[PDB]
């Protein structure tokens, strides 16, 4: 969502040709915090930021 902490995009492999097929945002591992307050919501956003830092690097 946020243009600064974005859910990452995960590639899809085509085994047969060896090229990489289209990718997409990850949609199986999202965290549902829609029932949380600002504390945990900030904590989760920080966690996703940490994950993004790990990936980029």
């Amino acid at each position: 969502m946020s243009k600064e902490i974005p859910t990452p995009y995960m590639w899809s492999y085509q085994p047969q040709m060896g090229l990489a097929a289209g990718a997409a945002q990850d949609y199986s591992t999202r965290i549902n915090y829609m029932s949380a307050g600002p504390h945990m919501i900030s904590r989760v956003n920080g966690i996703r930021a940490h994950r993004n830092r790990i990936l980029l690097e």
Partner: protein
């Protein structure tokens, strides 16, 4: 005060079956407990297999 829910239920989960399996796992099952109507269903193993 917090006018927001705190129990999130999806259509995928099957809490009935999960509770059944948990009851089977943690303790004995064949025993009968009338408080929760805790009676497990079964057949006579002679009726099922002649």
């Amino acid at each position: 005060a917090s006018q927001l829910n705190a129990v999130v239920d999806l259509q995928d989960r099957n809490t009935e079956l999960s509770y059944q399996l948990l009851l089977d796992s943690i303790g004995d099952r064949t025993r009968y407990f009338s408080m929760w109507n805790q009676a497990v269903d079964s057949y006579d193993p002679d009726v099922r297999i002649i």
